[PDB]
Amino acid sequence: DVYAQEKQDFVQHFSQIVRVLTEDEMGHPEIGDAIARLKEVLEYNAIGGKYNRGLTVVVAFRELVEPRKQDADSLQRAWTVGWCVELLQAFFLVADDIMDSSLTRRGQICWYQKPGVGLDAINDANLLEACIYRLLKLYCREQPYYLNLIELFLQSSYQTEIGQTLDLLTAPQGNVDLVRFTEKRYKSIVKYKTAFYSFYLPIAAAMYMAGIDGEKEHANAKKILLEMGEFFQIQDDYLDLFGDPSVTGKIGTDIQDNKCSWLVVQCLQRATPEQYQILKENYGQKEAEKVARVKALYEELDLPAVFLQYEEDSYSHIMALIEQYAAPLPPAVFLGLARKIYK
Amino acid sequence: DVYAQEKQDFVQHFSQIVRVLTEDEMGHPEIGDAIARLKEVLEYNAIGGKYNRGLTVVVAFRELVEPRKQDADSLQRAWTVGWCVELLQAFFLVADDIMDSSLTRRGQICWYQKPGVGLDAINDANLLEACIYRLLKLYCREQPYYLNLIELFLQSSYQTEIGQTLDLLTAPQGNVDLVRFTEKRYKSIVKYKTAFYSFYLPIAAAMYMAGIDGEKEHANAKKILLEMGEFFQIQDDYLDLFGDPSVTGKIGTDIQDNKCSWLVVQCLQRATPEQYQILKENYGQKEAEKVARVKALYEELDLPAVFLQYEEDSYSHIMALIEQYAAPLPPAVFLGLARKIYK
Ligand SMILES: O=C(O)[C@H]1Cc2ccccc2N1C(=O)OCc1ccccc1
Ligand SMILES: O=C(O)[C@H]1Cc2ccccc2N1C(=O)OCc1ccccc1
Ligand SMILES: O=P(O)(O)C(O)(Cn1ccnc1)P(=O)(O)O
Ligand SMILES: O=P(O)(O)C(O)(Cn1ccnc1)P(=O)(O)O
Ligand SMILES: [Mg+2]
Ligand SMILES: [Mg+2]
Ligand SMILES: [Mg+2]
Ligand SMILES: [Mg+2]
Ligand SMILES: [Mg+2]
Ligand SMILES: [Mg+2]
């Protein structure tokens, strides 16, 4: 719950972020209209979520850095790096919503779907990315971990991008072929498209800021964090169809997009030649009726129950991993995360 | 002509680049399909142009760094940084072709227009960007200019992105309003969307590699380079409509896209209330007839001649700038560039 005691201070620092970024037109009036657009873009896409990823940088920071070294300037940099993680995600989600033909996100209409935005949202996403490195310099240029954060963020983007590539290759539009929906392919996708930036990135950022840059340390943290991410994308896939729309804040499109979802991979393993054929003739299509068909098949195979059983086993497994790789880091760093993503 | 004597060695180094980048799946077989896609993406979008921007990094490198310090490893890094500039452009052009609804580029069909690619090209562009920093590390991580190159490339992207924002704001789809097509707005757009990455970036990269990191030096080089860029985007705008399609390698879309072109800004200044009205009812529309109308108006105002007159004045002006700000750098560095973009 260390998050709630940090959330308010985090969400308020955003004003300073938007203020420091727009402080560019202060010397270049000519790009005023562009800066105004960036602000609109920041306020629409960076605001509105739970901010857990960015908060994880703050929280972990106060648990890693010794209290004496937590001055006002350190907490200032920590909030910024946390907003960088949020910007990195805004960058990916804006573009992801376009490539997934999504309709909503965080209860509102997807940025690109907004009248007047359209494909211009592609450049809007590029600017959100650029802002990550602009902030990293304005606030951490003099820090000893500067370069480390830059490489970590670029690394995390490359990995995510590699992961989005698998996501899109395995889900060719209007090209249904359940054969490629294997468990191995699935784990690879989620590992790269979600696990790295959603769990490793935040913790690793805090680690580097705390001077902890040991390869073995990061690899151990990564061992726990990537496994958490795997579970998270599984849940995201599950909620995509069985989630409460008034809670998820976004309409599902996995079945229509012909995505290699956890639900489809699970369905295939537990399906009779008859069912398999039913899934094949209704998957990856926009027809509401067909999508309702696939769902009925999922509920018939008790997937919603299979998911609840995995969440538990996953939880136990992740905890077992913490007991083995947490040290020398405070177990709470990982325990705080597990508490938030599990029930 | 120092370019021609370097071109072949440059275009051949690409194989090593594609080889070093794909050398990632060597330890991560799971992302094999993604690496294959990246290769396809690199080969389709990074190959096919004149490579002047990247060549400029090589050329300038051999003119800045003392012969004794031009070992095999230095020329290796120089070719890489040059390919990074080409990748940065591939990144922007892929996305630019989508946002401009372009049809061709370099004589071939635009990447996103290719069957099976579509909006997935958005992530393909993101990967091209990621590759810039992957190469910079694999080849220059130990160099003293490493961080400088990283910041220069990110800076150049941010500026370009700021510039693409002005380009898109000033050209709202289906929203014709010639009032915003002013000369000042125009200079701002071209300055950010083209001048920085097409002329400053290449020379600056070579400078940093040559140890020349003085602020005053860069600012002086920038004085010359940005002015060259301004001229170049003007020519690009001119060729967009009056260029030889079998030479430009791309179909024009400025008028249809309602772009704040140099030609439209020039037309507005030299137009009677009658003409102004004609331009207003035919600009920013897909109808071939209407676009043919605007063109006829342009030829009526002798714009193709006005352009030829500006190219000359621009040339003299740029040369005057070299006589003033070239030093301490070898004038040839800038003279080589001027020779290539002027007639
Ligand atoms: O916020 C998120 O999306 C995920 C990602 C994340 C990273 C670090 C710490 C917590 C969390 N999350 C989390 O706690 O999610 C909980 C959740 C998941 C789905 C619906 C509602 C809440
Ligand atoms: O290659 C380019 O597009 C431009 C950009 C550039 C940067 C550095 C040095 C030369 C050049 N160019 C150049 O020489 O262009 C010449 C040109 C322009 C238009 C059509 C054909 C050749
Ligand atoms: O299911 P996706 O992977 O597309 C998603 O989780 C976003 N995303 C993108 C990369 N990783 C995750 P979302 O359901 O939020 O649209
Ligand atoms: O005219 P644009 O600025 O769109 C262009 O020059 C590309 N570009 C993009 C940024 N700067 C230049 P192209 O005519 O090559 O499509
Ligand atoms: Mg999505
Ligand atoms: Mg997606
Ligand atoms: Mg999902
Ligand atoms: Mg264009
Ligand atoms: Mg453009
Ligand atoms: Mg053009």
CATH of the domain at A130: 1.10.600.10
Cα–Cα dist B187/B163, whole Å: 10
Given an 8 Å threshold on Cβ–Cβ distance, is B127 in contact with A162? yes
Distance from CA of B330 to the nearest CA of A (A): 30
Nearest CA to A143 out of A55, A69, A201 is that of A69
End-to-end CA distance of chain A: 14
* Residue B244 annotated as catalytic: no
Residue B308 Cα distances to A8, B293, B313, angstroms: 60, 22, 9
What residues pair up with B104 in beta bridges, in sequence order? B109
Cα–Cα dist A87/A17, whole Å: 11
Angle, CA A284 vertex, CA A278 and CA A290 arms, to 5°: 50
Cα–Cα dist B58/B83, whole Å: 10
Given an 8 Å threshold on Cβ–Cβ distance, is A137 in contact with B158? no
Cα–Cα dist A167/A193, whole Å: 8
Annotated catalytic residue within B97, B124, B153, B193? B193
B337 Cβ inside 6 Å of ligand 2? yes
* Residue B100 annotated as catalytic: yes
Cα–Cα dist B280/B237, whole Å: 19
Residues of A designated catalytic: 50, 91, 96, 100, 105, 167, 193, 232, 236-237
A169: chain B residues, CB-CB within 8 Å = 33-34, 37
Nearest CA to B229 out of B187, B258, B280, B174 is that of B187
CB atoms within 10 A of CB B139: 22
Size of interface A-B (CB pairs under 8 A): 115
Are residues A261 and A269 in contact, defined by beta-carbon separation less than 8 angstroms?
Answer: no
Cα–Cα dist B252/B261, whole Å: 11
Cα–Cα dist A84/A74, whole Å: 15
Given an 8 Å threshold on Cβ–Cβ distance, is A165 in contact with B123? yes
Distance from CA of B183 to the nearest CA of A (A): 12
Residue positions counted in chain B: 343
Residue with tokens 């590759």: B131
Helix (H) or strand (E) holding A178, with range, is: none
- Which residue on chain A is closest to B174 by alpha carbon? A116
Annotated catalytic residue within B237, B240, B254, B257? B237
Helix A201-209 vs helix A215-242: angle between axes, to the nearest 10 degrees? 150
Given an 8 Å threshold on Cβ–Cβ distance, is A95 in contact with B126? yes
Q: In terms of DSSP H, where are the helices of B3-71?
A: 4-22, 32-45, 52-64
Count how many Cα atoms sit within 13 Å of the Cα of residue A216 in the half-sphere of its side chain: 3
Which amino acid is present at B135? L
Residues 6+ apart with CB under 8 A from B217: B207, B328, B329
Q: Which residues of A are annotated as a binding site for dimethylallyl diphosphate?
A: 105, 193-194, 233, 250, 259
Cα–Cα dist A31/A37, whole Å: 10
Given an 8 Å threshold on Cβ–Cβ distance, is B127 in contact with A161? yes
* Residue B232 annotated as catalytic: yes
Cα–Cα dist A121/B223, whole Å: 32
A168: chain B residues, CB-CB within 8 Å = 120, 123
Cα–Cα dist B252/B288, whole Å: 12
**Residue A67 structure tokens:** 């209290």
* Residue B213 annotated as catalytic: no
A31: chain B residues, CB-CB within 8 Å = 162, 166, 188, 192
Are residues A54 and A9 in contact, defined by beta-carbon separation less than 8 angstroms?
Answer: no
Number of domains in chain B: 1
Q: Which residues of A are annotated as a binding site for isopentenyl diphosphate?
A: 50, 53, 89, 106
Are residues B92 and A92 in contact, defined by beta-carbon separation less than 8 angstroms?
Answer: no
Chain breaks in chain B (C to N over 2.5 A) after: none
A257 Cβ inside 6 Å of ligand 3? no
Cα–Cα dist A104/A94, whole Å: 11
Helix (H) or strand (E) holding B165, with range, is: helix B146-170
Largest CA distance in chain B: 68
B191: chain A residues, CB-CB within 8 Å = 30
Cα–Cα dist B196/B202, whole Å: 9
Helix A262-269 vs helix A288-300: angle between axes, to the nearest 10 degrees? 60
Residue ranges making up the domain that contains A51: 1-343
Cα–Cα dist A173/A170, whole Å: 10
Are residues A153 and A167 in contact, defined by beta-carbon separation less than 8 angstroms?
Answer: no
Q: What is the DSSP letter of A199?
A: I
Q: What is the DSSP letter of A95?
A: H
Which amino acid is present at B257? D
Nearest CA to B141 out of A15, A151, A48, A53 is that of A151
Listed as own residue / partner, the contacts of B176-183 with beta carbons closer than 8 Å and 24 or more positions apart are B176/B258, B176/B280, B176/B283, B176/B284, B178/B264, B178/B268, B178/B276, B178/B279, B178/B280, B178/B283, B180/B260, B181/B260, B181/B264, B181/B265, B181/B268, B182/B265, B183/B265, B183/B269
Q: In terms of DSSP H, where are the helices of A100-214?
A: 121-140, 146-170, 183-190, 201-209
Given an 8 Å threshold on Cβ–Cβ distance, is B161 in contact with A119? no
Task: Report the SS3 class of residue B125.
Answer: helix
Nearest CA to A186 out of A221, A142, A233 is that of A233
Cα–ligand 8 centroid distance for B102 (angstroms): 7
Which residue among A91, A93, A103, A166 has the greatest number of ligand 3 atoms within 8 angstroms of its CB, and so is best to mutate?
A93
A340 Cβ inside 6 Å of ligand 1? yes
**Residue A120 structure tokens:** 């211009």
Residue B66 Cα distances to B60, B70, B211, angstroms: 11, 7, 11
Between strands A104-105 and A108-109, the pairing is antiparallel
Distance from CA of A244 to the nearest CA of B (A): 29
Cα–ligand 5 centroid distance for B122 (angstroms): 14
Q: Which of B123, B131, B169 is most worth mutating to test chain A (most A CB atoms within 10 A of its CB)?
A: B123
Are residues A111 and A97 in contact, defined by beta-carbon separation less than 8 angstroms?
Answer: yes
Per-residue burial over A188-209, b if 16 or more Cβ lie within 10 Å, else e, is bbbbbbbbbbbbbbbbbbbbbb
Distance from CA of A36 to the nearest CA of B (A): 10
Cα–Cα dist B224/B324, whole Å: 9
Q: Which atom of ligand 3 is nearest to the CA of A167?
A: 3
- Which residue on chain A is closest to B123 by alpha carbon? A161
Cα–Cα dist A129/A85, whole Å: 10
Given an 8 Å threshold on Cβ–Cβ distance, is B165 in contact with A122? no
- Which residue on chain A is closest to B164 by alpha carbon? A123
Ligand minimally distant from the alpha carbon of residue B235: 2
Q: Which atom of ligand 4 is nearest to the CA of B163?
A: 10
Residue with tokens 């690793």: A204
Cα–ligand 2 centroid distance for B229 (angstroms): 10
Task: Report the SS3 class of residue B271.
Answer: coil
* Residue B254 annotated as catalytic: no
B233 Cβ inside 6 Å of ligand 2? no
Given an 8 Å threshold on Cβ–Cβ distance, is A188 in contact with B30? yes
Q: What is the DSSP letter of B31?
A: G
Q: Which residues of B are annotated as a binding site for Mg(2+)?
A: 96, 100
